[PDB]
Ligand SMILES: Cc1cc2nc3c(=O)[nH]c(=O)nc-3n(C[C@H](O)[C@H](O)[C@H](O)COP(=O)(O)OP(=O)(O)OC[C@H]3O[C@@H](n4cnc5c(N)ncnc54)[C@H](O)[C@@H]3O)c2cc1C
């Protein structure tokens with residue numbers, strides 16, 4: 001199928017970069033794969049609207065067309081990013097802000113939202129340094145993107161994979177987490 | 189006391205802009221107040237680090253020095269923003285990422301984190317279209333910034349003021365909300381002081 005990897009990290013020799021390689025290398029050659037490196041793209045995450053440039057027409061903003069086109073083309077989205085302050089890094093938050101706009105990703109109905117990206121699925125791979133037991137007692141940590149961003153847009157299902165205590169553990173342990181990510185990627 | 193309002197909205201004629209105006213106008217004159225319009229500042233919310241520019245050095249990044257010094261100066265921070273996708277607009281999220289860095293806003297306890305912004309308190313003013321009953325149940329909606337950002341950095345107390353069904357309510361009801369903001373603002377006072 002058509003696969004869009006949206007990758008978020010400033011350092012090309014990061015552990016998250018390593019996670020990107022695992023996915024790319026283990027994705028079947030039957031898939032058609034494009035990677036969107038937000039940092040390398042120099043993506044501008046700051047959403048702007050006014051009376052001059054109306055919110056209503058955010059769906060037709062020229063600079064964002066390439067990214068709208070990438071999302072519409074994809075059948076399965078894979079997000080790779082570290083948890084910064086319980087959440088997506090700013091560049092990735094703004095990818096959503098700017099690209100997932102009304103009349104493109106969803107529309108307003110009588111009561112709530114109507115999703116428009118149906119037929120689409122996603123996989124979220126997050127890294128962070130919070131222990132696994134602590135996780136029921138925390139806000140977001142990938143759950144906002146999954147539960148309150150991708151789902152409302154009709155994208156289903158969404159698998160959320162957290163690699164936890166990621167700095168406290170050993171290289172050895174991180175290699176094992178890399179192996180499982182490769183494994184999971186293989187069985188898609 | 190020293191009050192830093194961090195304001196986040198791309199539209200100078202937005203409702204959020206009206207909330208800012210209500211806050212600025214109703215703060216006691218005994219306070220020294222500084223407003224940081226992230227959008228007017230053309231704030232770059234994209235945190236950069238790598239081999240060349242180590243994460244270790246972030247608390248010494250040049251462009252962000254203006255914004256570290258504002259935080260240090262403040263006794264009280266008021267955050268004003270619309271909820272976008274359950275949380276802070278990207279530009280404000282990057283404000284946290286780039287400014288509230290290790291060795292400035294916090295550092296590492298033998299076990300967890302040690303906040304470095306003690307002596308400060310905050311007020312978060314949010315707008316959104318979700319019913320208030322849903323607030324205890326939705327992820328974030330200002331709860332991350334209050335509970336998992338400001339608190340760990342040793343900022344306390346933190347007041348969370350949510351203006352709900354903001355676009356669904358009437359224009360009289362929105363004006364009523366503005367009155368509520370103005371009145372809370374008038375009560376931002378040092379202990380045993382009255383509003384000047
Ligand atoms: C602004 C900011 C905010 C943060 N807020 C949160 C908070 O809300 N929640 C909390 O849980 N965490 C928080 N953190 C920490 C963050 O989640 C981690 O730093 C991150 O998830 C690790 O991913 P990375 O690619 O950046 O790791 P890197 O720093 O690149 O590497 C991490 C570790 O893996 C190693 N490594 C790299 N490659 C390999 C390999 N091939 N094999 C084995 N090991 C390897 C490294 O050498 C290192 O020890 C925050 C960090 C920042 C900078």
Ligand SMILES: Cc1cc2nc3c(=O)[nH]c(=O)nc-3n(C[C@H](O)[C@H](O)[C@H](O)COP(=O)(O)OP(=O)(O)OC[C@H]3O[C@@H](n4cnc5c(N)ncnc54)[C@H](O)[C@@H]3O)c2cc1C
Nearest residue numbers: 097202203204206270271272273274315316317318362363
């Ligand atoms: C990218 C994006 C993502 C979003 N995600 C979420 C979601 O996660 N959850 C959901 O609950 N919300 C969501 N929203 C909606 C958002 O929270 C609201 O649009 C916002 O909070 C309203 O504040 P505003 O300043 O932008 O409103 P504005 O559009 O600027 O104005 C709103 C209303 O108030 C009126 N008004 C202006 N001034 C006054 C005044 N002085 N007195 C009385 N009325 C006045 C206006 O004329 C108007 O009818 C999202 C919006 C965007 C753009």
Ligand SMILES: CC1=CC(=O)c2ccccc2C1=O
Nearest residue numbers: 085129130290294301336340
């Ligand atoms: C809540 C939180 C905030 C951080 O800035 C942070 C930075 C580095 C490691 C862990 C953390 C963390 O758990």
Ligand SMILES: CC1=CC(=O)c2ccccc2C1=O
Nearest residue numbers: 102113148152273274317318
């Ligand atoms: C989940 C969600 C996402 C939105 O983009 C949004 C936009 C405008 C009003 C409400 C909402 C909302 O409830």
